[PDB]
Amino acid sequence: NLVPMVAAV
Amino acid sequence: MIQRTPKIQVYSRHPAENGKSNFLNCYVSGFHPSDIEVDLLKNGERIEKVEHSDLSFSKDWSFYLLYYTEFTPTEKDEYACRVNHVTLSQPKIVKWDRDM
Amino acid sequence: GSHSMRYFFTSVSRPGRGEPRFIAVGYVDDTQFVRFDSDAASQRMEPRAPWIEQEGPEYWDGETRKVKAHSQTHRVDLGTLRGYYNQSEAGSHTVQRMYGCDVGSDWRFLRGYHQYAYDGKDYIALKEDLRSWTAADMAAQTTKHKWEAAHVAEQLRAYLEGTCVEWLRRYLENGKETLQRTDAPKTHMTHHAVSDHEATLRCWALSFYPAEITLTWQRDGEDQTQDTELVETRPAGDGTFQKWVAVVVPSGQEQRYTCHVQHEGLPKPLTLRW
Numbered sequence: 001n002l003v004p005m006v007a008a009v
Numbered sequence: 010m011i012q013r014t015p016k017i018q019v020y021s022r023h024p025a026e027n028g029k030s031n032f033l034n035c036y037v038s039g040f041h042p043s044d045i046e047v048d049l050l051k052n053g054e055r056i057e058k059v060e061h062s063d064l065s066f067s068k069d070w071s072f073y074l075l076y077y078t079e080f081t082p083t084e085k086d087e088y089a090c091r092v093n094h095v096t097l098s099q100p101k102i103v104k105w106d107r108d109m
Numbered sequence: 110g111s112h113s114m115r116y117f118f119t120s121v122s123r124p125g126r127g128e129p130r131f132i133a134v135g136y137v138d139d140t141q142f143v144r145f146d147s148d149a150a151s152q153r154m155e156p157r158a159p160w161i162e163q164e165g166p167e168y169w170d171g172e173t174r175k176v177k178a179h180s181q182t183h184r185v186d187l188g189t190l191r192g193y194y195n196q197s198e199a200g201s202h203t204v205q206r207m208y209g210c211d212v213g214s215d216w217r218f219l220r221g222y223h224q225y226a227y228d229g230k231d232y233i234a235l236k237e238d239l240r241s242w243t244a245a246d247m248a249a250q251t252t253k254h255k256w257e258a259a260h261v262a263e264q265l266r267a268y269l270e271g272t273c274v275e276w277l278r279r280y281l282e283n284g285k286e287t288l289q290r291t292d293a294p295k296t297h298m299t300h301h302a303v304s305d306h307e308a309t310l311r312c313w314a315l316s317f318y319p320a321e322i323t324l325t326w327q328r329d330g331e332d333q334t335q336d337t338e339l340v341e342t343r344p345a346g347d348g349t350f351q352k353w354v355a356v357v358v359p360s361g362q363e364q365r366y367t368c369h370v371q372h373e374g375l376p377k378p379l380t381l382r383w
Binding site for chain 2: 228229
């Protein structure tokens, strides 16, 4: 189950 | 740009016995960037039906892939893996050795 | 023992034409269970293990939506990083991200990870405490400042200790017939003359799972590393792994040499003799 949102660098 | 050359192993999935269906593997690992050309060769000739694993990487970020094809080993036929990568001047050929 | 879930993401820019090539893969331990390839026809998160196919359409729709959003994030990152490093639009570059969690022997949260690399070098990584960041250079320092302000570590810690572990346990149950099965190495030794006074002993370990293994030689009960060769552990292609170690010995002295095999599937380590 993937993270709900990834943060952009 | 960090550039790491692929390590290469050519081997069979199952214990190799003449006349018995098997799989020929070419395992490439430890490389960067991910773009790579890998062919399996039968008697110097490129094999057409060759599949590969989905691109992944290790702790140190270097990539690995398994290339494989169904084959039946004989006494006569010779097999090898041919690898090209940005780090290599010319394609590198590694012969399948039954003992390894 | 311990178990892990990990996702691996790779994006590669293509300056000549079009969007980056994006590939995502999911693993439980040494078993791949899902994939996404931006250049594949389906444009969906796809199953790569029988036991994940149990999951219903809502799961697959959600993972597809998330993985597509992941892809767009990495696309933006490639642009961001080209700027930070003052690079031109001409060359191809790579971003990689890995994240996931481990459960320990007690089946509870053990460790979480979230790390990033640009062109194959460390960029930024979540520390073990899941509260702070390790930034390799001043570009990553900029990202660190952004991420601290937006409390990214907090969001990740919640996922890593919560959803990540919960779904890892779910997968471990649903795939228990294979995921919670150990396959002990099938071992044997071969002998080859290299001269009329020397021989090679090769100790093989085949068809084992998980990939973790130790193969060692001893001579008269003491560890022997000189005149040995040890190949890297390699996939068989059917989910199992293979490895061998060899030693060169004086002809007729083979009895002195023993191969020692340690694997999770073996109650006690194995000793092989020629």
